[PDB]
Amino acid sequence: ADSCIQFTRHASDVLLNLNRLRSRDILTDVVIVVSREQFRAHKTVLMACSGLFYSIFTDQLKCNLSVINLDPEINPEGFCILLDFMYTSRLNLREGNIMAVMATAMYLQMEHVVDTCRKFIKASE
Amino acid sequence: ADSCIQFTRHASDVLLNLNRLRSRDILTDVVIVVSREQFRAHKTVLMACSGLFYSIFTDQLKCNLSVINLDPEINPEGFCILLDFMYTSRLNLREGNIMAVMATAMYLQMEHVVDTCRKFIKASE
Amino acid sequence: AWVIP
Amino acid sequence: AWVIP
Ligand SMILES: CCNc1c(C)c(=O)n(C)c2ccc(Nc3ccnc(Cl)c3C#N)cc12
Ligand SMILES: CCNc1c(C)c(=O)n(C)c2ccc(Nc3ccnc(Cl)c3C#N)cc12
Ligand SMILES: [Cl-]
Ligand SMILES: [Cl-]
């Protein structure tokens, strides 16, 4: 209906609680493996944030996997930074990690992150 | 880190995608039964929005149930309105549904919704 | 909070 | 969008 009222902080409060569930390992249903590192997460949050995970978990066979192995070129710290961004809206972008974050965001199909990485790199040229 | 940048629309965009997954029945993992009506949802979104579902799905036995039956006094339309609010931040509050929405929000432990229902009722007294 | 969206 | 939170 068009007569709805809206609670401004709702989406942010939901994301905060999803991050609290992730921190406590509650109802996490997939482990993402990035070389030697493992990251537990919720498939729905991954799909909601990434074109790659949206494609993976809508596949009729991959939707049922409990472990997903990423390409060995993917940097675990870059993945960790992006996983934290998925669950908090905050991206820890630094001179020392920007190339890895951008490469990981291109692989994960997270265009908005790729765009801000490109802008930050271009400003330092 | 304290040097993060933030994408303002991220939380809202995540919630929009969770609602699209719900509409398409993708990765839904529980059916909530409210008298004769059934509602498919994601357990993590329910927990992130409701004190009752947070308690239910953190219980070591109930976390594994695929069906949850609500109290027979709960109005299905009231539940539907609140489930839509969980997934969109929009509450379809109307003169004809406010008492049922408020009763359902009290049962679901959604205080912010209870508070706005009380304010709207008080304004019409 | 609440607003008219 | 991006901002300093
Ligand atoms: C199909 C477009 N790829 C994406 C790109 C290219 C992208 O940059 N981002 C950030 C994205 C985020 C979420 C999603 N996920 C969804 C997009 C559309 N619809 C649904 Cl249900 C989901 C989910 N879950 C996709 C992308
Ligand atoms: C414990 C406080 N009850 C709640 C009340 C009374 C309430 O009014 N609301 C809206 C709520 C929303 C989410 C949640 N869910 C969480 C609250 C705190 N921590 C986590 Cl991990 C979750 C999740 N998932 C609880 C409540
Ligand atoms: Cl597997
Ligand atoms: Cl069951």
Coordinates of C-alpha atoms and ligand atoms in Angstrom, one line a residue:
Chain A
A1 CA 0.0 0.0 0.0
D2 CA 1.0 3.7 -0.5
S3 CA -0.2 4.7 3.0
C4 CA 2.8 3.1 4.8
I5 CA 4.9 4.8 7.5
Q6 CA 8.6 3.9 7.5
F7 CA 11.1 3.4 10.4
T8 CA 14.2 5.1 9.2
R9 CA 16.7 3.1 11.2
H10 CA 15.2 -0.3 10.5
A11 CA 17.6 -1.5 7.7
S12 CA 20.7 -0.4 9.6
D13 CA 19.3 -2.1 12.8
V14 CA 18.7 -5.4 10.8
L15 CA 22.2 -5.3 9.4
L16 CA 23.7 -4.7 12.9
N17 CA 21.8 -7.8 14.2
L18 CA 23.0 -9.9 11.2
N19 CA 26.5 -8.9 12.0
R20 CA 26.0 -9.9 15.7
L21 CA 24.7 -13.3 14.6
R22 CA 27.8 -13.7 12.3
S23 CA 30.1 -12.7 15.2
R24 CA 28.5 -15.4 17.4
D25 CA 28.3 -17.9 14.6
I26 CA 24.6 -18.1 14.8
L27 CA 22.8 -19.7 11.9
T28 CA 25.8 -19.3 9.6
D29 CA 25.4 -21.8 6.7
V30 CA 28.5 -21.5 4.6
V31 CA 32.2 -21.3 5.0
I32 CA 34.1 -19.3 2.3
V33 CA 37.6 -20.6 1.9
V34 CA 40.2 -18.1 0.6
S35 CA 43.5 -19.9 0.3
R36 CA 44.5 -20.9 3.9
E37 CA 41.7 -18.8 5.5
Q38 CA 38.1 -19.7 6.3
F39 CA 35.2 -17.2 6.8
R40 CA 31.8 -18.3 8.1
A41 CA 28.8 -16.3 6.8
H42 CA 25.1 -16.3 5.9
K43 CA 24.4 -17.2 2.3
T44 CA 21.5 -14.7 2.1
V45 CA 23.7 -11.8 3.2
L46 CA 26.5 -12.8 0.7
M47 CA 23.9 -12.9 -2.2
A48 CA 22.4 -9.6 -1.1
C49 CA 25.8 -7.9 -1.4
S50 CA 27.6 -9.6 -4.2
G51 CA 26.8 -10.5 -7.8
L52 CA 29.1 -13.5 -7.6
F53 CA 27.5 -14.9 -4.5
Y54 CA 24.0 -14.1 -6.0
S55 CA 24.9 -16.2 -9.0
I56 CA 26.5 -19.0 -6.9
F57 CA 23.7 -19.5 -4.4
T58 CA 20.9 -19.3 -7.0
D59 CA 22.5 -22.2 -8.9
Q60 CA 20.5 -25.4 -8.3
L61 CA 23.6 -27.5 -7.3
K62 CA 25.8 -24.8 -5.6
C63 CA 22.9 -23.4 -3.4
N64 CA 23.3 -26.6 -1.3
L65 CA 27.1 -26.5 -0.8
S66 CA 28.3 -25.7 2.8
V67 CA 31.8 -24.7 1.6
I68 CA 32.7 -22.4 -1.3
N69 CA 36.4 -22.2 -2.4
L70 CA 37.4 -18.9 -4.0
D71 CA 40.0 -18.4 -6.7
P72 CA 43.6 -18.8 -5.3
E73 CA 44.5 -15.3 -6.6
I74 CA 42.0 -13.7 -4.1
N75 CA 43.7 -12.1 -1.1
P76 CA 42.2 -13.2 2.3
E77 CA 42.6 -9.8 3.9
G78 CA 40.8 -8.2 0.8
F79 CA 38.0 -10.7 1.3
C80 CA 37.8 -10.1 5.0
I81 CA 37.5 -6.3 4.4
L82 CA 34.7 -6.8 1.9
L83 CA 32.9 -9.4 4.2
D84 CA 33.0 -6.8 7.0
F85 CA 31.6 -4.1 4.5
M86 CA 28.8 -6.5 3.6
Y87 CA 27.7 -6.8 7.2
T88 CA 28.3 -3.2 8.3
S89 CA 28.3 -0.8 5.3
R90 CA 31.8 0.3 6.4
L91 CA 34.8 -0.3 4.2
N92 CA 38.3 -0.2 5.7
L93 CA 40.0 1.2 2.6
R94 CA 43.8 2.0 3.1
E95 CA 46.8 2.7 0.9
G96 CA 48.2 -0.7 1.8
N97 CA 45.0 -2.7 1.0
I98 CA 43.3 -0.8 -1.9
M99 CA 44.7 -2.8 -4.7
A100 CA 43.6 -6.1 -3.1
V101 CA 40.2 -4.7 -2.1
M102 CA 39.6 -3.5 -5.6
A103 CA 40.6 -6.8 -7.2
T104 CA 38.5 -8.7 -4.7
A105 CA 35.5 -6.4 -5.3
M106 CA 35.8 -6.9 -9.1
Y107 CA 35.8 -10.7 -8.6
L108 CA 32.9 -10.5 -6.2
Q109 CA 30.9 -8.2 -8.5
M110 CA 30.6 -5.4 -6.0
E111 CA 30.6 -2.4 -8.4
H112 CA 30.1 0.4 -5.9
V113 CA 33.3 -0.7 -4.0
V114 CA 35.2 -1.0 -7.3
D115 CA 34.0 2.6 -8.2
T116 CA 35.2 4.1 -4.9
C117 CA 38.6 2.2 -5.2
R118 CA 39.1 3.6 -8.7
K119 CA 38.3 7.1 -7.5
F120 CA 40.7 6.9 -4.5
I121 CA 43.5 5.5 -6.8
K122 CA 42.9 8.2 -9.4
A123 CA 43.2 10.9 -6.8
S124 CA 46.7 9.7 -5.8
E125 CA 47.9 9.8 -9.5
Chain B
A1 CA 39.3 0.4 12.2
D2 CA 38.2 4.1 12.7
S3 CA 39.4 5.1 9.2
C4 CA 36.4 3.4 7.4
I5 CA 34.3 5.1 4.7
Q6 CA 30.5 4.1 4.6
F7 CA 28.1 3.5 1.8
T8 CA 24.9 5.2 2.9
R9 CA 22.5 3.1 0.9
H10 CA 24.1 -0.3 1.7
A11 CA 21.7 -1.5 4.5
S12 CA 18.6 -0.5 2.6
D13 CA 20.0 -2.2 -0.6
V14 CA 20.7 -5.4 1.4
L15 CA 17.1 -5.4 2.8
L16 CA 15.7 -4.9 -0.7
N17 CA 17.6 -7.9 -1.9
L18 CA 16.5 -10.0 1.1
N19 CA 12.9 -9.1 0.3
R20 CA 13.5 -10.1 -3.4
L21 CA 14.8 -13.4 -2.2
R22 CA 11.8 -13.9 0.0
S23 CA 9.4 -13.0 -2.9
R24 CA 11.1 -15.6 -5.1
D25 CA 11.3 -18.2 -2.2
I26 CA 15.1 -18.3 -2.5
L27 CA 16.9 -19.8 0.5
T28 CA 13.8 -19.4 2.8
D29 CA 14.3 -21.9 5.7
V30 CA 11.2 -21.7 7.8
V31 CA 7.5 -21.5 7.4
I32 CA 5.6 -19.5 10.1
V33 CA 2.1 -20.9 10.5
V34 CA -0.6 -18.4 11.8
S35 CA -3.9 -20.3 12.1
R36 CA -4.8 -21.3 8.5
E37 CA -2.0 -19.2 6.9
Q38 CA 1.6 -20.0 6.1
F39 CA 4.4 -17.6 5.6
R40 CA 7.9 -18.5 4.2
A41 CA 10.8 -16.5 5.5
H42 CA 14.5 -16.4 6.4
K43 CA 15.2 -17.2 10.0
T44 CA 18.0 -14.7 10.3
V45 CA 15.8 -11.8 9.1
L46 CA 13.1 -12.9 11.6
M47 CA 15.6 -12.9 14.5
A48 CA 17.1 -9.6 13.4
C49 CA 13.6 -8.0 13.6
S50 CA 11.8 -9.7 16.5
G51 CA 12.7 -10.5 20.1
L52 CA 10.4 -13.5 20.0
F53 CA 12.1 -15.0 16.9
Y54 CA 15.5 -14.1 18.3
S55 CA 14.7 -16.2 21.3
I56 CA 13.2 -19.0 19.3
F57 CA 16.0 -19.5 16.8
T58 CA 18.8 -19.2 19.4
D59 CA 17.2 -22.1 21.3
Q60 CA 19.3 -25.3 20.8
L61 CA 16.2 -27.4 19.7
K62 CA 14.0 -24.8 18.0
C63 CA 16.8 -23.4 15.8
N64 CA 16.5 -26.6 13.7
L65 CA 12.7 -26.5 13.2
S66 CA 11.5 -25.8 9.7
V67 CA 7.9 -24.9 10.8
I68 CA 7.0 -22.6 13.7
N69 CA 3.3 -22.4 14.8
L70 CA 2.2 -19.1 16.4
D71 CA -0.4 -18.7 19.1
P72 CA -3.9 -19.1 17.7
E73 CA -4.9 -15.7 18.9
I74 CA -2.5 -14.1 16.4
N75 CA -4.2 -12.5 13.4
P76 CA -2.7 -13.6 10.1
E77 CA -3.1 -10.2 8.4
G78 CA -1.4 -8.5 11.4
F79 CA 1.5 -11.0 11.0
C80 CA 1.6 -10.4 7.3
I81 CA 1.9 -6.6 7.8
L82 CA 4.7 -7.1 10.3
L83 CA 6.6 -9.6 8.1
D84 CA 6.4 -7.0 5.3
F85 CA 7.7 -4.4 7.7
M86 CA 10.6 -6.7 8.7
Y87 CA 11.7 -7.0 5.0
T88 CA 11.0 -3.4 3.9
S89 CA 11.0 -0.9 6.9
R90 CA 7.4 0.0 5.8
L91 CA 4.5 -0.6 8.0
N92 CA 1.0 -0.5 6.5
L93 CA -0.8 0.8 9.6
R94 CA -4.5 1.6 9.0
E95 CA -7.5 2.2 11.3
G96 CA -8.9 -1.2 10.4
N97 CA -5.7 -3.1 11.2
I98 CA -4.0 -1.1 14.1
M99 CA -5.3 -3.2 17.0
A100 CA -4.3 -6.5 15.3
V101 CA -0.9 -5.0 14.3
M102 CA -0.2 -3.8 17.8
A103 CA -1.2 -7.1 19.4
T104 CA 1.0 -9.0 17.0
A105 CA 3.9 -6.6 17.5
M106 CA 3.6 -7.1 21.4
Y107 CA 3.7 -10.9 20.9
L108 CA 6.6 -10.7 18.5
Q109 CA 8.5 -8.3 20.8
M110 CA 8.8 -5.5 18.2
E111 CA 8.7 -2.5 20.6
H112 CA 9.2 0.3 18.1
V113 CA 6.0 -0.9 16.2
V114 CA 4.1 -1.1 19.5
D115 CA 5.2 2.4 20.4
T116 CA 3.9 3.9 17.0
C117 CA 0.7 1.9 17.4
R118 CA 0.1 3.4 20.9
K119 CA 0.8 6.9 19.6
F120 CA -1.6 6.6 16.7
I121 CA -4.3 5.1 19.0
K122 CA -3.8 7.9 21.6
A123 CA -4.1 10.6 18.9
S124 CA -7.6 9.3 17.9
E125 CA -8.9 9.3 21.6
Chain C
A1 CA 12.0 7.5 14.2
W2 CA 9.1 7.0 11.9
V3 CA 8.4 9.1 8.7
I4 CA 6.2 9.4 5.6
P5 CA 8.5 7.7 3.0
Chain D
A1 CA 27.1 7.6 -2.1
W2 CA 30.1 7.2 0.2
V3 CA 30.7 9.3 3.4
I4 CA 32.9 9.6 6.5
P5 CA 30.6 7.9 9.1
Ligands
LIG1 C1 22.8 -8.8 -10.8 C2 23.6 -7.7 -10.5 N1 24.8 -8.0 -9.7 C3 25.3 -7.3 -8.7 C4 26.3 -6.4 -9.0 C5 26.9 -6.2 -10.3 C6 26.8 -5.5 -8.0 O1 27.7 -4.7 -8.2 N2 26.3 -5.7 -6.7 C7 26.8 -4.8 -5.6 C8 25.3 -6.6 -6.4 C9 24.8 -6.7 -5.1 C10 23.8 -7.6 -4.8 C11 23.3 -8.4 -5.8 N3 22.3 -9.3 -5.5 C12 21.0 -9.3 -6.0 C13 20.7 -8.5 -7.1 C14 19.4 -8.6 -7.6 N4 18.4 -9.3 -7.1 C15 18.7 -10.1 -6.0 CL1 17.4 -11.1 -5.4 C16 20.0 -10.1 -5.4 C17 20.2 -10.9 -4.2 N5 20.3 -11.5 -3.3 C18 23.8 -8.4 -7.1 C19 24.8 -7.4 -7.4
LIG2 C1 16.6 -8.7 23.1 C2 15.8 -7.6 22.7 N1 14.6 -8.0 22.0 C3 14.1 -7.3 21.0 C4 13.1 -6.4 21.2 C5 12.5 -6.2 22.6 C6 12.6 -5.5 20.2 O1 11.7 -4.7 20.4 N2 13.1 -5.7 18.9 C7 12.6 -4.8 17.9 C8 14.1 -6.6 18.7 C9 14.6 -6.7 17.4 C10 15.6 -7.6 17.1 C11 16.1 -8.4 18.1 N3 17.2 -9.3 17.7 C12 18.5 -9.2 18.2 C13 18.8 -8.4 19.3 C14 20.1 -8.4 19.8 N4 21.0 -9.2 19.3 C15 20.7 -10.0 18.3 CL1 22.0 -10.9 17.7 C16 19.5 -10.0 17.7 C17 19.3 -10.8 16.5 N5 19.1 -11.4 15.6 C18 15.7 -8.3 19.4 C19 14.6 -7.4 19.7
CL3 CL 29.8 -28.9 0.6
CL4 CL 10.0 -29.1 11.9

